[PDB]
Amino acid sequence: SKLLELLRKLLEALHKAIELLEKWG
Amino acid sequence: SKLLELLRKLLEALHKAIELLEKWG
Amino acid sequence: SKLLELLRKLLEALHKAIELLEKW
Amino acid sequence: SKLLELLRKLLEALHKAIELLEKWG
Incomplete structure (x- = not known):
């Protein structure tokens, strides 16, 4: 979840x- | 660019x- | 039920x- | 210039x- 959220924000x-x-x- | 935009929306x-x-x- | 299925498809x-x- | 630098890093x-x-x- 944290990596996907990172990707979204980036x-x-x-x-x-x-x-x-x-x-x- | 189109694929990255798709990924963002998804x-x-x-x-x-x-x-x-x-x-x- | 429908929301969990939606999440899975996504x-x-x-x-x-x-x-x-x-x-x- | 810096904006293009920002873009490159992102x-x-x-x-x-x-x-x-x-x-x-």
């Missing part, structure tokens, strides 16, 4: 980073 | 299902 | 998604 | 997390 962080990159660049 | 679905199972029952 | 779907990563 | 973490998931899941 994928969500990646998604936000990509969204930022798209906006500011 | 993990988010799983998390909601677990929250529901904690609430009801 | 976990089965996740298992398939992980098998795809191993290939590609 | 992707490297993701690679490691997926490897852990594959070995034990």
Whole structure:
């Protein structure tokens, strides 16, 4: 459960980073 | 990217299902 | 009963998604 | 520049997390 939760949060962080990159660049 | 996005959405679905199972029952 | 089955199907779907990563 | 650095590190973490998931899941 902890690894899956880690993965979920990390994928969500990646998604936000990509969204930022798209906006500011 | 498409497969990672699928995985994120699936993990988010799983998390909601677990929250529901904690609430009801 | 329906919620437990839903959880099982979701976990089965996740298992398939992980098998795809191993290939590609 | 730093945002691309952030992205690169998050992707490297993701690679490691997926490897852990594959070995034990």
